[PDB]
Design an enzyme around this catalytic site. Sequence first.
Site, PDB file in Angstrom:
ATOM      1  N   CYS A 134     -19.916  25.731  89.839  1.00  0.00           N
ATOM      2  CA  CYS A 134     -18.836  24.988  90.434  1.00  0.00           C
ATOM      3  C   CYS A 134     -17.840  25.972  91.018  1.00  0.00           C
ATOM      4  O   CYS A 134     -18.236  26.956  91.679  1.00  0.00           O
ATOM      5  CB  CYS A 134     -18.239  23.949  89.472  1.00  0.00           C
ATOM      6  SG  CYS A 134     -17.920  24.679  87.906  1.00  0.00           S
ATOM      7  N   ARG A 192     -16.993  22.532  85.220  1.00  0.00           N
ATOM      8  CA  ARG A 192     -17.814  21.353  85.487  1.00  0.00           C
ATOM      9  C   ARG A 192     -19.289  21.659  85.291  1.00  0.00           C
ATOM     10  O   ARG A 192     -20.046  20.826  84.742  1.00  0.00           O
ATOM     11  CB  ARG A 192     -17.550  20.780  86.882  1.00  0.00           C
ATOM     12  CG  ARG A 192     -16.114  20.331  87.089  1.00  0.00           C
ATOM     13  CD  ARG A 192     -15.918  19.998  88.545  1.00  0.00           C
ATOM     14  NE  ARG A 192     -15.514  21.188  89.254  1.00  0.00           N
ATOM     15  CZ  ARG A 192     -15.317  21.234  90.557  1.00  0.00           C
ATOM     16  NH1 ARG A 192     -15.530  20.164  91.321  1.00  0.00           N
ATOM     17  NH2 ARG A 192     -14.926  22.362  91.101  1.00  0.00           N
TER      18      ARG A 192
END
Lengths: 412, 416
Positions: B366, B371
């Site tokens: 990410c 994430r």
Amino acid sequence: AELAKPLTLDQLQQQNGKAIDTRPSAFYNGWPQTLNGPSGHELAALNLSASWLDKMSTEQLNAWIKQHNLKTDAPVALYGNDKDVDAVKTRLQKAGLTHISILSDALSEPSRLQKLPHFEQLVYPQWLHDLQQGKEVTAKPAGDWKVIEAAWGAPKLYLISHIPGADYIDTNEVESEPLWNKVSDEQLKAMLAKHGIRHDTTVILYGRDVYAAARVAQIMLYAGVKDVRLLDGGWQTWSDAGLPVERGTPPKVKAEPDFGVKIPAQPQLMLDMEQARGLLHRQDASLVSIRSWPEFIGTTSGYSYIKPKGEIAGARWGHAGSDSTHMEDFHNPDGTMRSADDITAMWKAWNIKPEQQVSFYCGTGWRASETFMYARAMGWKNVSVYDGGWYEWSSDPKNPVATGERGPDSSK
Amino acid sequence: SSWAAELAKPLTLDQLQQQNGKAIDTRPSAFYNGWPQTLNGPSGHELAALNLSASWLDKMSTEQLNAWIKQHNLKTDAPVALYGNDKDVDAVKTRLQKAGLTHISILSDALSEPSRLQKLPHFEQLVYPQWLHDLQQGKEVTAKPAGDWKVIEAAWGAPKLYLISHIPGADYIDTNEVESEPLWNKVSDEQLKAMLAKHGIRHDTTVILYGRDVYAAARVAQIMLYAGVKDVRLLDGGWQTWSDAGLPVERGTPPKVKAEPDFGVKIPAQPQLMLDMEQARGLLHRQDASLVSIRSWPEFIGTTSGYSYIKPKGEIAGARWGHAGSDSTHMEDFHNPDGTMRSADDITAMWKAWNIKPEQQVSFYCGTGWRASETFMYARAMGWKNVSVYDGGWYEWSSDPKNPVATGERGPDSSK
Ligand code: NA
Ligand code: NA
């Protein structure tokens, strides 16, 4: 669209793949395709007959794939007749299997094949036709044989069409009020003489519903007819094959007043209530409920005339069908008996095993008779039917009853 | 007709399947995912069942329910069969009728046959509040830790909300203890060794992480897995699920932890769970590998970097979109309305449409890895065997203007 590289059985094994036999089950079961031909299927092969495909929706096929543990990228090697192989290839491709070959050496070594130990007890229509015509067939009856349709009540659909030379049995001839248990030994003897059956007559039974013929079949085995067989899948398979039919009332049968052995010759094939109750809570024995899940859990009795709901406490679920008049869990999409491996696995999960003394029951004995015949075909050496079933058991409110959702552990 | 009152007849799974219908599991996702409702009970869901938990309904608007219905392709009239407890089935039935579905039945033989159930191959890695509470109180639980275990809250910065409340017996770990400037990559092996020792963690301590945000705990969890903590788990949906269950809480500063100086294996025991830039580049342009962007669509197409302190806009060329959320700090595409991990079947389908598949070597990135750690933890619970995080992500990749960059609306074909 194209097949992957062809594989031998040995290579498929080394690659942890699965063999799929695309022939009808009769052949998968052990019936040779031509006289003296190879008998049975390859070690651990699955059966997916091309003839079933038009009766398998997308979700049915997906369920069958999962249930047989076909891993999405593992090799599958198909065999059988070339049109069937291609038809199965296409469906499995749509279902998303990615490594589909032919099993190149399929059926080339007769000595390594596996078969239903008594496949000859489940006949299929072409075989019966050839027997009728005097053609030499595998496992020919030793002497006289008779073909007989079984159903509830007076002949009805039989009058419209039936298998050529078929006699007819009303199920009321073998069972009756008040329990829908089998009639007396004396009444069975009269019944056998009337339909011209001796202990050494091969009897080939069929019905519109397999369970009606199985019910009659199990009772005759009890009485002492040694060679009793079912038309696998019942009448529908004969209809669908487009073989000849006859019509009208059953022709006169020549009585055979001397059965040739004392009836009953196999009394152990039928249990009463105390005997059935004696199987419970044992590792070496199983009392097997062949009732639908809603029957097993007590939602419904399954029957208009049976008020009590619930199950025999300690009965191990053998599966059955969607309601009391259906047997989907034992049937291929064409109504024939599912693969012995599959039935074996389903029963094993509930601790129902071939080394046990096993007795099947249901509402009144019909569905249990069907599973009894299959178990017999499968080589299970101690099987029986507990005739009285739920109708009898629940007539006595002192008998232990189970209700509710539960699994295999709960019937130790 | 619109007054009509008969019950649609119940269907067996065999029947539902004959008719190409849909099953709908109304239980909380923990049980859908495979957690049994009783020790040794049935584990998982019926083949291809959807999960629509009754407990999500008060967080689903008319629009959301409609979008969920359409996303799972429930045809107005095709048979739908529900299962679960009676209260939940009824709550879900009522909402589905009000959305206009018409052939709604009970799946009469649901869960009657354990061997045909489907579940996360490692559902036990995603725990739920009642399980943890029961563990704490000496009860028998499924997939009990083998030896010692620790619960740990993870969040960016010093203890804030943790002081107001936290899970009982939870320790606290500041994310700055596992990662730092200049790249926001994990700290050195040496510093992780010290981090672990100071928190009482040996290679055979089960660690149960949760955060106010799931991705904080996933970040710390994946780094612990890399270091060599064998058994690492997340509270599915994070703190919010414990708070909503109304379970007991504790207050105040983190109690002192008994230091554990001997880790018991060489750190890192699983180096292959983290990729560097060179290793990540090596996954691009392959059918047997994917470098997966867990970034918002506007990040993926170059509209925004997603970050204050990251100037370049665009995406690693050849990376495959793995979805994420609405902007750089949300994860809607991986969450149910209660914050828990969305269905594995949906995540699998969403990844597959972008040519991201379990057979591949797969690495998530990410902006800086948070994430990506969340999706890593999900793929791990999903039993994906060759997954990793490419730590440097867009921040590292784009710091060098020589690295190729993709921009604009595009589909999976532009990533072969
Ligand atoms: Na009976
Ligand atoms: Na990073």
